[PDB]
């Protein structure tokens, strides 16, 4: 993380929307009287469709499982679709745009739709934490170090 | 190790519907 | 919304929630080219369970099959369940409580969950018109001893 | 039923009583 | 200036949340029969906050006004706050962090929180196009060089 | 000539929409130290307009205050408006229809919109209580009457 | 700052109703 | 024949709330 890099990139968000939404609690009566301490098993799956030349749909499947041991608390799956314009860049920069940067746009939409569904099933708030796929792709190609908190205030 | 709530991971294929960006091997 | 309250009729809402939610837009960005109000179809299934002494959960599988032109727009199904502390009821009116007034409580929440997922899927909004099905049940029940029921708990 | 475009009207079968409404086991 | 690849400067997100939200459809019952020609004004506000040693919360309040010629369609204003632990390597180096890449963290969330209120206010799909501030600040830091093209000819 | 019953009537939902939003988390970054169910204060406020004849646009302003201990945590507010076509009926019969029933349709939509802004402010689970607002008037307008179990024993 | 749990009160001002929900006059 | 959807531009200030964030032009 010290790179200059060109922008160029012919990018425009065409339309964002929830293609698929789901929330399952078949144990809903029984699970509400349980002590709330779930093992949140995430799942991240990738999907797309070509609508035209340079017009491509980025879908990211975000699937949140919650299990209080053998008791399944719930399952939730939101597949956030987003139509984006891709041109200008090619190779690993285009791969950065698609496999990190474009579903980063879709991340807060998928996030709110899951946490809403949790609260619709009357389970306590489960907000997804910010995952930088982008910064994880910044990790390769080079060496990765990290400075610590120095703790400095003066007046 | 990650000192954060769950946190996702990178993708085996770099997710590319446009062309197909990856190593040829 | 109401029934024959000539007894010690009890009805204290414990809780309303979603045991199952679904929204499926398969043709989504292709079908958005069809910018108009989709042909919407409502469907119902029965499901419920006894949780405790005079405490009973009622579930309605509300289904919305929507289609733009001659193809699918979106498929939106919510199994809206709700627990109610009910007592002081006898005979066929016990079947009316769960077959009219309890689904009547769940109908605003079923409609809302669907309507929200429609707007999230960026389709033209659709609010289901309120029906007094309670009354239609009463007319039929009060002119027969045919107290029928199905054992169905797939929820 | 009388499902209509968007109407409850009448359930496919009489829902349940509070009596048992389930297999007793 | 961090000329060598190493990643000396370091980033950790503690928390991201809206500290203020406001949607206003002033003429909402009237505005749906009006001429839909959205002339959307963009207005940026900045808010500073220091919570602890090396714990700095930068906030960006994004304002979106939509006007149908002379009549206001709606308003959507979201103060997107974010607690960011930023330290190790100061000056224009850190200025590119807090004033360029940290905006890019909050901006998808601030987009979505606006888009959500628009969708809840039953208006057509509205997404503000992604602007990579950070790359164009590298353009002034030490220019944009390093044209990568790691290509893969295959389908 | 004049039977004491809901004569004719006409009810249809035209369009439901969020007209206005407010969220203010004053003590937000600091008050997160306090984790429990925040001290709530809901405040219900009126906003209305008659668009045409037989067409009334009913809004329900749901103001929310939430506090952690001795200080305010967050503030939320939604104005869920809804156009409804109501006709035929007149007097106390329509005073209840717009005074309870129409806002009660809009209550679930406002409810989720509050809990959304709470979730965006990363605050504890805040869900509004399920009330049958129509029943509150209905129990006043009905004479309460029941029966009793009868026995006999001679020793 | 107050301390309570939800609210919901029967409107003391009532709701502003329809002026003659019969004849567009 | 091309157009562009509404977008932001570079923040004409570059905010620096943190101490020691010296910007020598």
Swiss-Prot record, chains A, C, E, F:
PANTHER family reported for this sequence: PROTEIN-EXPORT PROTEIN SECB, PTHR36918
Single Gene Ontology BP annotation: protein transport
Native source organism of the sequence: Escherichia coli (strain 55989 / EAEC)
Gene Ontology cellular component list: cytoplasm
Description of how the protein assembles with itself and partners: Homotetramer, a dimer of dimers. One homotetramer interacts with 1 SecA dimer.
Record function comment: One of the proteins required for the normal export of preproteins out of the cell cytoplasm. It is a molecular chaperone that binds to a subset of precursor proteins, maintaining them in a translocation-competent state. It also specifically binds to its receptor SecA.
Family indicated by similarity: Belongs to the SecB family.
SUPFAM superfamilies the record matches: SecB-like (SSF54611)
InterPro entries, per the entry: SecB (IPR003708), SecB-like_sf (IPR035958)
Keywords associated with the record: Chaperone, Cytoplasm, Protein transport, Translocation, Transport
Gene3D superfamilies in the cross-refs: SecB-like (3.10.420.10)
NCBIfam families per UniProt: PRK05751.1-1, PRK05751.1-4, secB
Localization in the cell: Cytoplasm
Superkingdom of the organism of origin: Bacteria
Stated name of the protein: Protein-export protein SecB
Gene of this entry: secB
HAMAP family: SecB
A GO MF label: unfolded protein binding
Swiss-Prot record, chains B, D, G, H:
Superkingdom as given in the UniProt entry: Bacteria
Signal sequence range: 1-21
Compartments it resides in: Periplasm
Subunit structure: Isozymes 1 and 3 are a dimer of identical chains, isozyme 2 is a dimer of heterogeneous chains, one of each of the subunits from isozymes 1 and 3.
Family from the record: Belongs to the alkaline phosphatase family.
Protein name: Alkaline phosphatase
Species name: Escherichia coli (strain K12)
Taxonomic lineage of the native organism: Bacteria, Pseudomonadati, Pseudomonadota, Gammaproteobacteria, Enterobacterales
Parent sequence residues shown: 1 to 25 of 471
């Amino acid at each position: 993380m010290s790179e200059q890099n060109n922008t160029e990139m012919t990018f425009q968000i065409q339309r964002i929307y929830t293609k698929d939404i789901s929330f399952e609690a078949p144990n809903a009566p029984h699970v509400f009287q349980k002590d709330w301490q779930p093992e949140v098993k995430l799942d991240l799956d990738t999907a797309s469709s070509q609508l035209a030349d340079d017009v491509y749909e980025v879908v990211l499947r975000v699937t949140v499982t919650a299990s209080l041991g053998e008791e399944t608390a719930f399952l939730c799956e939101v597949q956030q679709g987003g139509i984006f314009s891709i041109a200008g860049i090619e190779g690993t920069q285009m791969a950065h745009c698609l496999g990190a940067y474009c579903p980063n746009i879709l991340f807060p939409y998928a996030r709110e739709c899951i946490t809403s569904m949790v609260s619709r099933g009357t389970f306590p708030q489960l907000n997804l934490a910010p995952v930088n796929f982008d910064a994880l792709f910044m990790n390769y190609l080079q060496q990765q170090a990290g400075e610590g908190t120095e703790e400095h205030q003066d007046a | 190790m990650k000192q954060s709530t769950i946190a996702l991971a990178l993708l085996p294929l770099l997710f590319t519907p446009v062309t197909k960006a990856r190593t040829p091997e």
